[PDB]
Design a protein around this nucleic acid. Sequence first.
RNA 1: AGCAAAAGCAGG
Lengths: 67, 121, 611, 511, 51
Amino acid sequence: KYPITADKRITEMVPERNEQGQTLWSKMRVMVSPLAVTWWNRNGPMTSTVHYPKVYKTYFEKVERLK
Amino acid sequence: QVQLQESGGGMVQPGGSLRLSCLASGFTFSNYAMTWVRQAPGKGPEWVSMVSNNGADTTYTDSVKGRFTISRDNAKNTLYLRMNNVKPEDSAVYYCAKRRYGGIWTGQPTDYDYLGQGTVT
Amino acid sequence: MDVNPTLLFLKVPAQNAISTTFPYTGDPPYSHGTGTGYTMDTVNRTHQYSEKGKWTTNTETGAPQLNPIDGPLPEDNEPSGYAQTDCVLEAMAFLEESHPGIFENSCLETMEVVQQTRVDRLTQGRQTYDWTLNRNQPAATALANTIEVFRSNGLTANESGRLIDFLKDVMESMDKEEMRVNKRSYLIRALTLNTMTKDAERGKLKRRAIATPGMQIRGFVYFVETLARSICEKLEQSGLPVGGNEKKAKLANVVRKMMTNSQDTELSFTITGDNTKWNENQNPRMFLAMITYITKNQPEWFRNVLSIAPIMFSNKMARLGKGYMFESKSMKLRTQIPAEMLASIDLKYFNESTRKKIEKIRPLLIDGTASLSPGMMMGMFNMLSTVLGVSILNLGQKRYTKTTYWWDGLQSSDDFALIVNAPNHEGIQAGVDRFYRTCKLVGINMSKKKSYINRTGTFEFTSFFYRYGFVANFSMELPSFGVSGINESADMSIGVTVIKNNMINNDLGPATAQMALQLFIKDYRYTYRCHRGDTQIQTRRSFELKKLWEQTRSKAGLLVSDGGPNLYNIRNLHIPEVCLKWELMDEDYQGRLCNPLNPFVTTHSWIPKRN
Amino acid sequence: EITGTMRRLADQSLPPNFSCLENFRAYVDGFEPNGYIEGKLSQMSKEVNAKIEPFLKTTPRPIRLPDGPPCFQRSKFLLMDALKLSIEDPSHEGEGIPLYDAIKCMRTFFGWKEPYIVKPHEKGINPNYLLSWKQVLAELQDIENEEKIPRTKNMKKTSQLKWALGENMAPEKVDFDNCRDVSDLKQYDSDEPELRSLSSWIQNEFNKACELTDSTWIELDEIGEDVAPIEYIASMRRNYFTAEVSHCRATEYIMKGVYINTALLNASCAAMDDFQLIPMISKCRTKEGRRKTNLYGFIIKGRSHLRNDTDVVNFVSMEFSLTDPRLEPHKWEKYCVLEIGDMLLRSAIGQMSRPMFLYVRTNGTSKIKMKWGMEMRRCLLQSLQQIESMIEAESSVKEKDMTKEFFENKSETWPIGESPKGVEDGSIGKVCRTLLAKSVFNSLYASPQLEGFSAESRKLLLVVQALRDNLEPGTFDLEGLYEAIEECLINDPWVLLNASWFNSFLTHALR
Amino acid sequence: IKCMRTFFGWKEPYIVKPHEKGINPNYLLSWKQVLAELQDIENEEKIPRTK
RNA sequence: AGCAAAAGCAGG
């Protein structure tokens, strides 16, 4: 377990265990679990910013050529 | 013209099996995805399964996983559904329908065409 | 009842069903044992090929070097690397006469590239031979090694950043008598070339023993191969630098150009095959002569800095490898014997075939490493050899064969495909015997065993089999179709990009490529455990997937590593995944994804803990 | 910045006629062609010339297979005679550490007689392998009944297993000076091995291995929808393909091999110093039920420290068997067959009650062969690639471009069978199966003999197609092809059978 | 464990009934300890028969 | 004993 590595900053945002109790991160930075990711994507800050298509909007243009 | 005539249904005993067939004619079959949608007497319909054009992307309801197996044969332009371990609550009238688009997930499960028949156990 | 796939191969056309004779769907055999025996046999074979040629010892080396050129004409059809430089020069002369201005233009391209080039490019190689540890090592460590030893030396070109000054100062300190290594030992150590048995040689029984060069010669071969790439790009008969479907069309185009039979009162055959002993019967002397002729009327310094490669080809002392591992039968004990002492040991512990090989080579051993230069180094991507051999095909312009019959075609590094014409079987036999003779007079040996000949329409070349108009190809086998092993964000991307490259370049049909993507996503999920949300399979993770999968608003619009479906197919492979999903996703998920608050930066991306 | 010493080396590198770099450069720069080539040609011996010949219809003699002892099997797991103790369709949420699924399946079967050997090995020591199997059964019952459920079990060191893997068989590295005094030493017994003769057993194994098993053996998921044309053509081709392939026994061997090799590589990279038990376990979905974990056979992995990937790892393998030995004792000179009593098979009438024997052979594979046996899904894919290449060729020669023209029609168009005084024809189904199984055996009996044969049979068959279509082919030296083929036919049965197939092909084609 | 593994639908624990005596949060954290202990033993230990 | 081959493993 614990394939993923990441900083200590994540420790504040999310718990050490989920509802079932299986762990997201543990110390010997902290090792983080892949479950930790899928916990972010269920509950996390929602923000309607469109800055990240700064350059990712390029690929949409290539798809408009297809469809 | 587009018509969907289904068959293979009948009476069975609880915990058995059934093989529902649906023959479609009048349109380009290999292009559109297909759906099984059932309706129990008294309750509005509920979608049973959605199957792709390739027959590779399949999706079932949250209460029928492991018991059902949906498939299709493009030669005779036909749709097969294998129901195993029939629970008493699956006792409803089953419906074969042809999706609006060729997709499965694009849009919520709703159809725009006709229907055949369905048996009850 | 008995069964056979050979009879489906009976009826079916051979070239279309040829892949059935492509059994490479399993691990290649490899060489468990030290290649040194195969090396000794290769050296024995090439020195036997040039035994008529005289040799004289090189100064400061102690080593016999054989010069086959200006040797006699061969006696027997058995191959032998005997050639005459005049043939080479008149060949290149007819070439430039045929293709005017091509030489000077490629030369100017070489000038501008050497002026613009930089040392930073060469270090991105694989297993250049280092001289300190006396073992093949990576190229970055190699560059660090040479620049630090040069910092110790009196030269200062590693600080310059340019490259030709770097090669020049390599040469200057290479002429030094001490570094902690004397001049003779150092010149034997710089010219040394690891033996390093071939691995993955598909389609043989015994092993070729590909030997590899070091970094110091690598830049010289880089420059001359850049010239070769330019001149072959401006050529129409090369096969190596031309590639992909353009190469596929070039094959068909040359057979078009020569198969058109105006006044077809003459029968026509079109050879294919494989020129055996390509890396043996050739020679660097012919290469140096070619080089001198190619850069006519140019800056003298360029002439020199591009002639330096064939000369150090012309004297090279490759190693032999590890050695052997003798063993006691009764007492049952074994040891490795480094062959550096092989020029001292008795000739009784060994095997008899091995023994006779040793006595053949034991004279030819100086510092233990075998010396030889009648023959090319095994397995280099030279392609100036194609520039050579294609001139032969150019001789069969009817102006210059000066007879009724005439040849033409194309020729990559080992394969070759002539196309001839003559009024009868007798005339074609006459002209092809003339060609085979000529091709030997330049020191190129067309084998008579594993080659053949036929009417036009069907001919092999470089495995791009060409039946009448069909151009099936089996150049390289499909590789792996498995994850790259980095992260759920880019592994998928890497796999799709690899699939796209191998369908666009090679002949991965889409019918197999969808299935390849299918196996790939299966492996992706089974590795990262992350099957579909709407499933019934269990694992560690599946809790959160079955949680988020209902948590969503748009269900199919999800990335695959978290419960999502794979909307890829052969239409939309170059694009990434989240571009295809983005506006099919709701702002909660999309906002959770692209956010600098993630430690992940692309939130699926990350670094795994080292192990 | 030549420094002259390079001019020295250069002037020494040149041909003998010219002694300097500068005279060479002046000669070349001042060079012109004067028709030297014709003087060279006329000067030459006429002996040195490549003479064509008519590669006539009656010329190519039947390639003579080598003669010697009978060919013997070397597969890492037997192929036709094996059987599988089912699990009877467990649930869908219950994962299983594989030992417990195996144990459950071994627990299912009763019919264990006392072990007594049925085949004399003729070498080694048969009783020791008997007692090895005994240790296995005892260890398994003892761990599971009365310990804290260990996920993975490694056996106990004994005379039996330690003999059958030879942890003492290693000699030790030493310096040269201390042993040069000894005269017993030899470089190595590096020589050709014993010849072998073709026999009938491998043909039977292949025939069984092309045949349809009953189950499905492989699933396949969904992919993005299909809009463009080429997408639909790819979809239909792959669907036809996988549906035809899935009911193979070749695909059974495929998943079996993949799981076996993955398990072994996991173990060896993760565990070296310990004799491990592993099952030959494979996951198969029943056509009409649930997922089924079949137990083919146990494994006793031998210790594995892989300083290089090329290195061999040795082990012992136990795969159950119904069919008796001594019907084909040539097929194995290597097995060590035990008796393990009866299994009560049920036929349409009565009950068979045939005995049960076990083939506790030993072996050793590799790291590399394990990797390439893990990647046999590629081999399946490669069979698809070949079929698609055939069909694209038929689409280029005929613009119909019709996959459906061949994939499903009832049309006898493909011969793969040779019968007494007959040739059988089959459909694309049998042929896709056969091409697959050929590639699988290529993946199992991969050996340089095969690659040599492949190149040489390829060239000669190409020449024979050139002949049969009246394309006036020629070959300069032919007995070279024949002797090199005979060189590559050393011992491998699969090679040998491809050669007998080549032979009968020559005969029935008549070229 | 297999049956508890079957069910999904676990929200965060917050008490719904005031005990009016004792300490409700402590029983909440007891239940938390239970779930955590069960997942932790079964995922990453040598399968103890009784915990 | 075995693997597999014109040389190596069978632990360092």
